[PDB]
């Protein structure tokens, strides 16, 4: 839970007690009993559904606001999931914070920059969703990716933009 939790946040390996994760937004409404926890949210067009174990906390009623990574069964949100639930820009806001919680425990406090740099190194690369001239799934570079769409566009013609996908 120390130096350990360290690591699980800079591998970007599954939490330990994993906690869920929210998809869309509109307002929060969770159902109230059964084994699967029926909730039902809102927005446009979408709704909810999820299916965990026994033992969980929700902390948020049928009322408010759900967005996506949210307090579900409140613990180690998958910073996996979270990438695809809200976006790379959000998880470099969070992992950078609890590490520097867990160093803010133990009363040694060290600038934000440092640990910036290196998520930002774990988020570097992307995988291909939409091929164009290369190969789809395959892993690689976002600024590689810039070259891409920069010189197809501003100096050739191929307009065939390959759709990158974040990758932590």
Partial sequence: QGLPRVIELFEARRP???????????????????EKLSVFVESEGFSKEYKLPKEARLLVKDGDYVEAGQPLTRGAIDPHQLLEAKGPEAVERYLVEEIQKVYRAQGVKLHDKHIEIV??????????????????????????????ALNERLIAEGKTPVAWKPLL
């Fill in 16 to 34: 330990k007690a994993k906690a869920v994760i929210s998809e869309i937004d509109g307002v929060v409404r969770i159902e109230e009993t059964e």
């Fill in 119 to 148: 998520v930002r190194q774990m988020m570097k690369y992307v995988e291909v969703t939409d091929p164009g001239d290369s190969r789809l799934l395959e892993g690689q570079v976002l600024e590689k990716w810039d070259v891409e």
